Amino acid sequence: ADLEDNMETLNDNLKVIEKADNAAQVKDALTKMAAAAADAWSATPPKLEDKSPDSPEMHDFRHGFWLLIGAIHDALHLANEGKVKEAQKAAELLKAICNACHQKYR
Amino acid sequence: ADLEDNMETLNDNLKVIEKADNAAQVKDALTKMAAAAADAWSATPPKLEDKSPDSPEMHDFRHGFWLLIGAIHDALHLANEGKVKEAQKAAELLKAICNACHQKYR
Amino acid sequence: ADLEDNMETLNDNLKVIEKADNAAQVKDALTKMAAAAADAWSATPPKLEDKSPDSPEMHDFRHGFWLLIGAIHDALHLANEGKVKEAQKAAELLKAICNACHQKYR
Amino acid sequence: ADLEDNMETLNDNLKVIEKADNAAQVKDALTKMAAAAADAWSATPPKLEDKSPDSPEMHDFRHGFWLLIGAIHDALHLANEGKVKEAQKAAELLKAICNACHQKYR
Numbered sequence: 337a338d339l340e341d342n343m344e345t346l347n348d349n350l351k352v353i354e355k356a357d358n359a360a361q362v363k364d365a366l367t368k369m370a371a372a373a374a375d376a377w378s379a380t381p382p383k384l385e386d387k388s389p390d391s392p393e394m395h396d397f398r399h400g401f402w403l404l405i406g407a408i409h410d411a412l413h414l415a416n417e418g419k420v421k422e423a424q425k426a427a428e429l430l431k432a433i434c435n436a437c438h439q440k441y442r
Numbered sequence: 443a444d445l446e447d448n449m450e451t452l453n454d455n456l457k458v459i460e461k462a463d464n465a466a467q468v469k470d471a472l473t474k475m476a477a478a479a480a481d482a483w484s485a486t487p488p489k490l491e492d493k494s495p496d497s498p499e500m501h502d503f504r505h506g507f508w509l510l511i512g513a514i515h516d517a518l519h520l521a522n523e524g525k526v527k528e529a530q531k532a533a534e535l536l537k538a539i540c541n542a543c544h545q546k547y548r
Numbered sequence: 549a550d551l552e553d554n555m556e557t558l559n560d561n562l563k564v565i566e567k568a569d570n571a572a573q574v575k576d577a578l579t580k581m582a583a584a585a586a587d588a589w590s591a592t593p594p595k596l597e598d599k600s601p602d603s604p605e606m607h608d609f610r611h612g613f614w615l616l617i618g619a620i621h622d623a624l625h626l627a628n629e630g631k632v633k634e635a636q637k638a639a640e641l642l643k644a645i646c647n648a649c650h651q652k653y654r
Numbered sequence: 655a656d657l658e659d660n661m662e663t664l665n666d667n668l669k670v671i672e673k674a675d676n677a678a679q680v681k682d683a684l685t686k687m688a689a690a691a692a693d694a695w696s697a698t699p700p701k702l703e704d705k706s707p708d709s710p711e712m713h714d715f716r717h718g719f720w721l722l723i724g725a726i727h728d729a730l731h732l733a734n735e736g737k738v739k740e741a742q743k744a745a746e747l748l749k750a751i752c753n754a755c756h757q758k759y760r
């Protein structure tokens with residue numbers, strides 16, 4: 337899927353988690369976020385279209401997805417353990433990862 | 443790319459790291475491995491074609507890619523720091539992640 | 549060292565990173581933070597003095613240290629790579645880990 | 655506790671996991687391993703007694719403990735999720751982390 341679609345999937349599922357009642361909802365939304373982050377991995381953002389695929393900027397861009405993927409990984413373990421409140425909290429915190437990338441590259 | 447193509451990319455680049463001379467070679471191979479791992483994320487393996495996309499098996503299958511992605515991440519920092527030998531060691535160690543998934547799912 | 553002393557070491561070094569000029573300063577402060585977090589690992593906080601060492605709360609308390617140790621780990625690689633600004637950014641972000649544990653257990 | 659004691663703790667509990675029947679035994683042993691790894695963090699090994707505390711060797715020494723702590727972290731989530739077999743597998747795999755540090759510094 338395209339970068340915009342993966343970003344919409346990320347945005348929509350984060351909102352789902354905030355509103356969620358049970359573990360199943362949170363688990364499913366995180367799984368979907370994990371897929372979208374991984375699918376966005378090798379995307380070239382408009383701001384970096386002129387840059388080398390192995391430029392410091394693109395390396396830093398990719399690092400941001402590593403960080404997001406890693407945060408979703410832990411949030412899902414928390415949701416798998418029945419720790420729904422803590423998983424929702426982890427989901428809120430990973431917005432800073434979104435924001436940090438967006439500030440530089442969006 | 444298809445699962446088999448991504449597995450060959452993983453295989454080929456791990457061999458490149460083993461025989462590598464300098465940091466640039468190791469860095470480039472690891473980046474290529476990271477892209478292949480990420481692109482393999484949502485693949486359904488032959489052995490699990492009958493299974494639910496959100497079965498315990500498929501979640502366990504995806505978990506294995508989380509571990510590989512995470513390992514490649516650290517190895518790349520080591521190579522970025524000029525710690526070539528330790529990056530090569532890290533690449534050798536992550537073979538156990540390849541092996542563990544293969545045993546269960548290949 | 550005691551929990552309070554490890555907490556002051558964490559606080560003091562985080563402020564050092566914010567005001568830091570070069571990589572060496574950031575590297576040193578993060579190393580000191582890493583040692584303090586690790587030394588804090590087996591501490592029992594006043595709020596959990598009556599709880600079992602293997603209670604859900606103590607397990608969750610320790611989990612917070614795992615997250616902090618992990619975050620410090622990645623920030624140090626960034627500082628090791630000369631990526632000072634992104635290391636400082638990473639240090640800012642991990643304040644959420646401090647805050648999340650404090651909210652529950654301080 | 656001293657380095658030798660922490661290494662004995664790591665060794666004894668790894669053996670406990672191998673022989674374990676249920677989740678609770680695996681969970682408790684991993685938690686004990688996590689405590690020992692964290693307590694070993696700032697130890698100076700006999701082989702590096704003459705080295706600077708911030709030499710490449712001591713940074714590499716400490717990095718090995720980050721790796722072990724991270725591996726125990728994941729294994730405990732697996733045991734927490736009732737995935738005992740997988741947790742036991744994960745505990746076997748982290749022996750390579752023990753071995754890799756020993757080869758260099760023991």
Ligand code: HEM
Nearest residue numbers: 340343346347381382397400401404433434437438441442
């Ligand atoms: C869960 C956290 C995230 C959320 C909620 C999120 C959400 C969004 C949204 C709603 C957009 C606008 C889509 C559009 O352009 O129509 C966007 C764009 C973008 N995001 Fe994210 N995102 C997240 C994570 C990230 C990360 C980690 C990165 C960097 C690695 C990133 C990089 C970008 C870039 C470069 C764009 C601009 C794409 C364009 O202009 O077409 N995002 N994001």
Ligand code: HEM
Nearest residue numbers: 446449450452453487503506507510539540543544547548
């Ligand atoms: C860096 C580590 C890895 C390496 C070096 C590697 C290498 C390979 C190779 C050479 C193949 C044979 C495909 C071919 O004929 O071209 C393969 C297949 C396969 N691997 Fe991996 N792999 C790794 C990681 C993983 C992981 C982490 C998983 C599971 C999460 C996985 C699951 C599979 C599956 C299901 C196949 C069968 C593909 C098919 O024949 O349709 N692999 N891998």
Ligand code: HEM
Nearest residue numbers: 552555556558559562593609612613616645646649653654
């Ligand atoms: C870099 C991250 C952190 C910073 C900068 C920080 C800072 C502080 C500070 C300044 C104090 C005041 C207590 C004193 O020293 O007199 C404190 C107390 C405390 N912190 Fe942290 N903290 C951090 C992370 C954490 C984490 C991760 C946990 C738990 C996992 C935690 C648990 C506590 C508890 C329980 C107290 C109360 C201890 C007492 O009252 O004796 N903190 N922290």
Ligand code: HEM
Nearest residue numbers: 658661662664665699715718719722751752755756759760
């Ligand atoms: C689960 C993994 C590990 C196990 C089972 C383990 C076990 C042991 C044991 C049984 C010893 C002998 C204790 C003695 O000196 O009488 C030892 C020594 C030692 N280990 Fe490990 N260890 C592990 C992880 C590590 C790691 C990751 C490092 C490096 C960061 C490390 C560094 C050392 C060093 C430097 C010694 C020599 C200490 C001395 O001679 O006083 N160990 N280990």
Ligand SMILES: [Zn+2]
Nearest residue numbers: 339340343382
């Ligand atoms: Zn747009």
Ligand SMILES: [Zn+2]
Nearest residue numbers: 338340341344
């Ligand atoms: Zn669209």
Ligand SMILES: [Zn+2]
Nearest residue numbers: 410413611727
């Ligand atoms: Zn965790």
Ligand SMILES: [Zn+2]
Nearest residue numbers: 516519625717
């Ligand atoms: Zn590392």
Ligand SMILES: [Zn+2]
Nearest residue numbers: 515519622625
């Ligand atoms: Zn990183």
Ligand SMILES: [Zn+2]
Nearest residue numbers: 657658661700
């Ligand atoms: Zn000895």
Ligand SMILES: [Zn+2]
Nearest residue numbers: 656658659662
């Ligand atoms: Zn002793």
Ligand SMILES: [Zn+2]
Nearest residue numbers: 409505728731
């Ligand atoms: Zn995991």
